[PDB]
Amino acid sequence: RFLKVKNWETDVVLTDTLHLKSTLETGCTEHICMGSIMLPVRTKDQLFPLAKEFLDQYYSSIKRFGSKAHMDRLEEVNKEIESTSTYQLKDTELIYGAKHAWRNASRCVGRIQWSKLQVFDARDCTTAHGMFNYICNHVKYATNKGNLRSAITIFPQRTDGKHDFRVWNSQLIRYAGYKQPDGSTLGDPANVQFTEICIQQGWKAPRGRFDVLPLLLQANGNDPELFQIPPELVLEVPIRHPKFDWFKDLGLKWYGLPAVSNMLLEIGGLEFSACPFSGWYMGTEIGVRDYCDNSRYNILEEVAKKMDLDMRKTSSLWKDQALVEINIAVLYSFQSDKVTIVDHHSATESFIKHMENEYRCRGGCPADWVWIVPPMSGSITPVFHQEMLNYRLTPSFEYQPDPWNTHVWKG
Amino acid sequence: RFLKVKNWETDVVLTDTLHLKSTLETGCTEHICMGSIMLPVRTKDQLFPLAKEFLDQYYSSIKRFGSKAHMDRLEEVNKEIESTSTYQLKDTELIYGAKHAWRNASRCVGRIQWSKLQVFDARDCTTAHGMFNYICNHVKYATNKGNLRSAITIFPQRTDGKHDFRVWNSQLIRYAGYKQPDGSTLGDPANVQFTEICIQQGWKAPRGRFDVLPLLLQANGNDPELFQIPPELVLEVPIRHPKFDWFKDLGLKWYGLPAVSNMLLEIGGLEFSACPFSGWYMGTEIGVRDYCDNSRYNILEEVAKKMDLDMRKTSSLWKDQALVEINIAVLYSFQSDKVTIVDHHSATESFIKHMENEYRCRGGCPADWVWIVPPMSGSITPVFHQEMLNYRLTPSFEYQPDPWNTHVW
Ligand code: HEM
Ligand code: HEM
Ligand SMILES: Cc1cc(N)nc(C[C@@H]2CNC[C@@H]2OCCNCC(F)(F)c2ccccc2)c1
Ligand SMILES: Cc1cc(N)nc(C[C@@H]2CNC[C@@H]2OCCNCC(F)(F)c2ccccc2)c1
Ligand SMILES: C[C@H](O)[C@H](O)[C@H]1CNc2nc(N)[nH]c(=O)c2N1
Ligand SMILES: C[C@H](O)[C@H](O)[C@H]1CNc2nc(N)[nH]c(=O)c2N1
Ligand SMILES: [Zn+2]
Q: Cα(B170)–Cα(B189) distance, rounded to whole angstroms?
A: 14
Q: Looking at the complex, does the CB of residue A8 fall below 8 Å from at least one CB of chain B?
A: yes
Q: Characterize A320-357 residue by residue with b for buried, 16 or more Cβ atoms within 10 angstroms of its Cβ, and e for exposed.
A: bbbbbbbbbbbbbbbbeeebbbbbbbbbbbbbbebbee
B177-179/A253-255 β-pairing: unpaired
Query: Domain B124-149+164-235+399-403 falls in which CATH fold?
Result: Nitric Oxide Synthase;Heme Domain; Chain A, domain 2 (3.90.440)
Q: Cα(A337)–Cα(A332) distance, rounded to whole angstroms?
A: 9
- The DSSP element (H or E) to which A263 belongs, if any, is strand A263-267
Q: Cα(A16)–Cα(A299) distance, rounded to whole angstroms?
A: 42
Q: Is A391's CB within 8 Å of B32's CB?
A: yes
Instruction: Using alpha carbons, list the distances in angstroms from residue A67 to A56, A57, A89.
Output: 11, 13, 18
Q: Looking at the complex, does the CB of residue A19 fall below 8 Å from at least one CB of chain B?
A: yes
Question: Which residues on chain A are in Cβ contact (under 8 Å) with B289?
Answer: 379
B16-123+150-160+264-278+348-372 matches B236-258+281-346 in fold: no
Name residue A153's beta-bridge partners.
A120
Probe target for ligand 1 pocket from A36, A106, A107, with the most ligand atoms within 8 Å of CB = A107
Q: Is B389's CB within 8 Å of A32's CB?
A: yes
AA letter at A339: V
Sign of CA dihedral A102, A106, A110, A111: positive
Per DSSP, the residues of B208-247 read STTPBPPEEEE-TTPPPEEEPPPGGGS-EEE---SS-GGG
Question: Which residues on chain B are in Cβ contact (under 8 Å) with A3?
Answer: 32
Question: Residue B280 annotated as binding?
Answer: yes
Probe target for ligand 4 pocket from B34, B139, B260, B284, with the most ligand atoms within 8 Å of CB = B260
For ligand 6, is residue B35 a contact (CB within 6 Å)?
no
Q: Which CATH architecture has domain A16-123+150-160+264-278+348-372?
A: Alpha-Beta Complex (3.90)
Rounded to 10°, the helix A44-61/A91-103 angle is 90
Beta carbons within 10 angstroms of residue B249's beta carbon: 10
Q: Cα(A340)–Cα(A318) distance, rounded to whole angstroms?
A: 29
Chain B residue with minimal CA distance to A294?
Answer: B9
CB B182 within 8 A of CB B318: no
Probe target for ligand 3 pocket from A38, A143, A295, A373, with the most ligand atoms within 8 Å of CB = A38
CA-closest residue to ligand 1 atom 24? A279
Residue from B48, B32, B391, B108 nearest A391 by CA: B32
Q: Cα(B56)–Cα(B69) distance, rounded to whole angstroms?
A: 11
AA letter at A75: E
Q: Cα(B175)–Cα(A75) distance, rounded to whole angstroms?
A: 68
A185-187/A236-238 β-pairing: unpaired
Q: Cα(B148)–Cα(B87) distance, rounded to whole angstroms?
A: 33
Q: Is A319's CB within 8 Å of B345's CB?
A: yes
Instruction: Give the active site residues of A.
Output: 108, 111, 280, 285
Residue from B91, B84, B51 nearest B70 by CA: B51
Q: Which residues contact B307 (CB under 8 A, 6 or more apart)?
A: B244, B318, B321, B322, B325
Question: Which residues on chain A are in Cβ contact (under 8 Å) with B391?
Answer: 31-33
Does A375 sit behind a cis peptide bond, omega within 30 degrees of 0 on the bond before it?
no
Alpha-carbon A102 to chain mean position: 9
Question: What's the full length of chain A, in residues?
Answer: 411
**DSSP state, A211?**
P
Q: Which residues contact B260 (CB under 8 A, 6 or more apart)?
A: B170, B171, B276, B277, B278
Q: Tell me which of A8, A320, A335 to substitute to probe the interface with B (most B C-beta atoms closer than 10 Å).
A: A320
Name residue A175's beta-bridge partners.
A212
Atom of ligand 5 nearest to the CA of B387: 1
Domain spans of chain B, in order of start? 16-123+150-160+264-278+348-372, 124-149+164-235+399-403, 236-258+281-346
CB A262 within 8 A of CB A275: no
Q: Which residues contact A68 (CB under 8 A, 6 or more apart)?
A: none
Q: Which residues contact B105 (CB under 8 A, 6 or more apart)?
A: B111, B396, B397
Q: Cα(B137)–Cα(B120) distance, rounded to whole angstroms?
A: 9
Rounded to 10°, the helix B44-61/B68-84 angle is 160
CB B241 within 8 A of CB B329: yes
For ligand 5, is residue A32 a contact (CB within 6 Å)?
no
Chain B residue with minimal CA distance to A28?
Answer: B30
- Which residues 293-352 on chain B approach chain A with CB closer than 8 angstroms? 293-295, 300, 314-317, 319-321, 323-324, 327-328, 331, 335, 343, 345-346
Three-class SS of A156-205:
CCCCCCCCCCEECCCECCCECEEECCCCCEEECHHHHHHHHHHHHCCCCC
Query: Residue B100: helix, strand or coil by DSSP?
Result: helix
Q: Is B389's CB within 8 Å of A34's CB?
A: yes
Q: How many Å lie between the alpha carbon of B285 and the closest alpha carbon of chain A?
A: 11
Q: Which ligand is nearest to the CA of A387?
A: 6
Q: Characterize A33-71 residue by residue with b for buried, 16 or more Cβ atoms within 10 angstroms of its Cβ, and e for exposed.
A: bbbbbeeeebeeeebbebbeebbebbbeeeeeeeeeebe
Instruction: Using alpha carbons, list the distances in angstroms from residue A74 to A16, A49, A58, A95, B87.
Output: 30, 10, 11, 18, 66
Instruction: Give the active site residues of B.
Output: 108, 111, 280, 285
Q: What is the resolution of this structure in A?
A: 1.9
- Which residues 351-370 on chain A approach chain B with CB closer than 8 angstroms? 368-370
Summary count for chain A: helices (H), strands (E): 12, 18
Q: Which CATH superfamily is domain B236-258+281-346 in?
A: Nitric Oxide Synthase; Chain A, domain 3 (3.90.1230.10)
CA-closest residue to ligand 6 atom 3? B36
AA letter at A35: G
Distance B388 CA to ligand 7 centre (A): 11
For ligand 6, is residue B397 a contact (CB within 6 Å)?
no
Distance B62 CA to ligand 4 centre (A): 32
Q: Cα(A400)–Cα(A402) distance, rounded to whole angstroms?
A: 7
Q: Tell me which of A28, A339, A355 to substitute to probe the interface with B (most B C-beta atoms closer than 10 Å).
A: A28
Cα angle B85, B87, B91 (rounded to 5 degrees) comes to: 170
Summary count for chain B: helices (H), strands (E): 12, 16
Chain A residue with minimal CA distance to B241?
Answer: A316
Burial of A147 (0-12, 13-18, 19+ CB in 10 A): exposed
Q: Which ligand is nearest to the CA of B110?
A: 2
A277-278/A151-154 β-pairing: antiparallel
Q: Cα(B109)–Cα(B348) distance, rounded to whole angstroms?
A: 7
Residue from A34, A296, A107 nearest B5 by CA: A34
CB A211 within 8 A of CB A234: no
Q: Is B369's CB within 8 Å of A35's CB?
A: yes
Name residue B271's beta-bridge partners.
B266
Q: What does residue A368 show for φ and ψ, rounded to 5 degrees? A: -100, 100
Q: Is A327's CB within 8 Å of B316's CB?
A: no
Q: Is B32's CB within 8 Å of A327's CB?
A: no
Name residue B7's beta-bridge partners.
B386
Which technique was used to obtain these atomic coordinates? X-ray
Residue B96 exposure: Cα atoms within 13 Å on the Cβ side: 15
- First CA to last CA distance, chain A: 55
Beta carbons within 10 angstroms of residue A8's beta carbon: 13
Q: Cα(A158)–Cα(A403) distance, rounded to whole angstroms?
A: 14
For ligand 6, is residue B317 a contact (CB within 6 Å)?
no
Q: Cα(A117)–Cα(A127) distance, rounded to whole angstroms?
A: 25
Name residue B27's beta-bridge partners.
none
Q: Tell me which of B38, B308, B313, B315 to substitute to probe the interface with A (most A C-beta atoms closer than 10 Å).
A: B315
Query: Residue B296: helix, strand or coil by DSSP?
Result: coil
Q: Within B144-229, where are the H helices? A: 192-200
Question: What's the full length of chain B, in residues?
Answer: 409
Burial of B29 (0-12, 13-18, 19+ CB in 10 A): middle
Sign of CA dihedral A307, A311, A316, A320: positive
